[PDB]
Design an enzyme around this catalytic site. Structure first.
Site, short mmCIF file in Angstrom:
data_model
loop_
_atom_site.label_atom_id
_atom_site.label_comp_id
_atom_site.label_asym_id
_atom_site.label_seq_id
_atom_site.Cartn_x
_atom_site.Cartn_y
_atom_site.Cartn_z
N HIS A 72 36.47 47.46 57.91
CA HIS A 72 36.54 47.59 56.47
C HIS A 72 35.11 47.90 55.91
CE1 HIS A 72 36.79 45.79 52.42
NE2 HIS A 72 38.10 45.98 52.51
N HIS A 73 34.12 47.17 56.42
CA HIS A 73 32.74 47.43 56.06
C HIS A 73 31.76 46.90 57.12
CE1 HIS A 73 31.98 43.48 53.93
NE2 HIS A 73 30.77 43.74 54.41
N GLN A 108 26.33 42.98 60.53
CA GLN A 108 27.57 42.36 60.08
C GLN A 108 28.74 43.34 60.09
OE1 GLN A 108 28.83 41.12 55.67
NE2 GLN A 108 27.33 39.69 56.59
N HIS A 124 32.78 43.67 59.13
CA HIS A 124 33.89 42.97 58.46
C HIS A 124 35.16 43.67 58.85
CE1 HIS A 124 36.50 42.48 54.63
NE2 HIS A 124 36.75 41.48 55.46
N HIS A 133 26.85 42.86 43.91
CA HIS A 133 27.51 41.73 44.56
C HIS A 133 27.79 40.55 43.64
CE1 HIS A 133 28.91 39.05 47.67
NE2 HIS A 133 28.02 38.15 47.30
N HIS A 177 31.20 37.30 43.39
CA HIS A 177 32.48 36.91 43.99
C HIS A 177 33.70 37.29 43.09
CE1 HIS A 177 29.75 33.92 46.40
NE2 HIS A 177 29.59 35.17 46.79
N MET A 236 27.87 34.51 42.18
CA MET A 236 26.57 35.11 42.45
C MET A 236 26.56 36.35 41.61
SD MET A 236 26.09 35.13 46.63
CE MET A 236 24.31 34.91 46.46
CU LIG Z 1 34.71 44.56 53.84
CU LIG Z 2 27.92 36.10 47.50
#
Ligand SMILES: [Cu+2]
Ligand SMILES: [Cu+2]
Length: 303
Positions: free
Chosen positions: A58-59, A121, A123, A193, A195, A262
């Site tokens: 996905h990323h 990372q 995802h 970014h 949430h 955040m």
């Molecule tokens: Cu993702």
């Molecule tokens: Cu965050």
């Protein structure tokens, strides 16, 4: 069959940064691994080539830091990415394709002030029930050169720490502002970014009372690096300003931003090599009264 380091010519090499055959077992899984730089001197990251499994992944994010959160072959990124500051270098998202580094621009790693490690990372989004056996080697190949680049990429991180969302308030603004007082930086991409409660995040350079948009995005869309159509020069005496717009609708308690929430805006820039800083941050709101006359555009939602 590709080795972790591939010499390319006298001055350049590629690093192949890949998951060590991992098996995500639920939808929505974050895996992380590290790759130390093989050189101790300064080197410059000048290109990236994504190698993502085009169903499941996905990323992907690539960071530079000096202390990865784990020393194991891979870990869950819930554990953290780096225990020191993690400097984002690259994002890839399946339905929001990256834009190339501008010609002559590299990130500076290694040496005295640069990152010693990359942290990847990956995802993994939704998973078919029946792939419990499946090994994945997703990641990125990285082009490094020991040739000094004329222009050095870095990150200007704007982060909100001060604001809270009273439950059921439909619109809450989190404002960030710092004066800029370095040599010129030229902003060529950004990433937002928050949430679940973020509606929109916008970044501006303010110069003599005039606001120039750097970028604005719904933080619920793919959090890749979106290109800035024409790079925005930010110079000594300018203010950088950001606004995150949040909702508290359907909540039942205060949400502190900076953290159930955040408000992060990552502003990717280049600077002339002799004046360059790899990383700058703003975590305050130095000119709050300036936001009374922010462009109306900053408050307009995005899907
Ligand atoms: Cu993702
Ligand atoms: Cu965050």
């Amino acid at each position: 069959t590709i080795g972790p380091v591939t010499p390319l010519d006298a001055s350049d090499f590629a690093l192949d940064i890949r998951m060590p055959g991992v098996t995500p077992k639920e939808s929505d899984t974050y895996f992380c691994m590290s790759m130390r730089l093989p050189v101790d001197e300064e080197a410059f990251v000048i290109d990236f080539k994504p190698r993502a499994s085009m169903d499941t992944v996905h990323h992907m994010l690539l960071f530079g830091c000096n202390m990865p959160s784990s020393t194991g072959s891979y870990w869950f990124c819930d554990e953290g990415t780096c225990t020191d500051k993690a400097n984002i270098l690259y994002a890839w998202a399946r339905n929001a394709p990256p834009t190339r580094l501008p010609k002559g621009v590299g990130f500076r790693v290694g040496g005295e002030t640069g990152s010693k490690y990359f942290v990847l990372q990956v995802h993994y989004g939704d998973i078919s029930a029946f792939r419990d056996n499946h090994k994945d080697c997703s990641g990125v190949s990285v082009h490094l050169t020991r040739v000094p680049q004329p222009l050095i990429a870095g990150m200007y991180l704007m982060m909100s720490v001060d604001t809270v969302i009273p439950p059921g308030e439909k619109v809450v603004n989190a404002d960030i502002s710092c004066q800029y007082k370095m040599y010129p930086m030229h902003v060529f991409a950004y990433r937002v970014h928050t949430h679940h409660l973020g509606k929109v995040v916008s970044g501006y350079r303010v110069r003599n009372g005039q606001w120039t948009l750097i970028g604005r995005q719904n933080p619920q869309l793919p959090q890749a690096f979106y290109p800035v159509e024409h790079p925005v020069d930010v110079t000594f005496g300018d203010i950088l300003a950001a606004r995150c717009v949040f909702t508290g609708e359907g909540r039942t308690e205060a949400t502190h931003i900076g953290s159930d929430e955040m408000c992060n805006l990552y502003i990717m820039y280049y600077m002339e090599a002799k004046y360059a800083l790899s990383f700058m941050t703003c975590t305050k709101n130095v000119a709050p009264d300036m936001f009374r006359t922010i462009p109306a555009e900053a408050n307009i939602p995005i899907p």
